[PDB]
């Protein structure tokens, strides 16, 4: 899944 700081 996406990293904590992604998007």
């Amino acid at each position, epitope marked *: *899944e996406l990293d*904590x700081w*992604a998007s």
Partner: antibody
Amino acid sequence: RITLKESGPPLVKPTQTLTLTCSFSGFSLSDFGVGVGWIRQPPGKALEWLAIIYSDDDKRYSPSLNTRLTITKDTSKNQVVLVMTRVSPVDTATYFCAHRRGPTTLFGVPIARGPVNAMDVWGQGITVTISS
Amino acid sequence: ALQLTQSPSSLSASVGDRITITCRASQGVTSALAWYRQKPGSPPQLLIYDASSLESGVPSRFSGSGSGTEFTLTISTLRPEDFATYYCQQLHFYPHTFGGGTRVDVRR
């Protein structure tokens, strides 16, 4: 100044539980956005990512080692503990704990997420050998 | 899952050389990539964060470029302390995978 240091048993037998402790200073695990991860390096091989824990207590693990790993923090003692169960000889490696920066803030408000894209300060590493 | 492939896996050079090391991701990782230098018997040291940002206290000869799937680390004028192993790390997806490493040794 930020410093991290790993502690634990230098020798562990197969099927046993390995408890590793990352003692730190320079930051608090109660500071916004901060993370502490664990990375291993088997003799003469590449670095392998293991797990990470953040200030809000969110934890993430390597899918390959998920069932065997448990990461926890003790904010008051400035420590992060990694527990690896059912160890086998392939887990013989140097284990490193590392700091992850949170976003750069302006008056407490996050303005740059760039500094989070790395593990900036690392501990010396602890050499663990698994043999019966 | 996501694979980080480093190229070349081994490199030979001399003091004063300009070397480039490449790291390629199987899927787009935006700018979430870091470069580390690891000296024998020492922990990895951060060189570049966020693909191109120079880490504080790290010498000017190190520079990183690229975004998405193609990333490069260049050392302008190789110094004797640069003969080591280099690693790239992806931090856009969990797990935060590391590349296989690139060994930089003395040419002869």
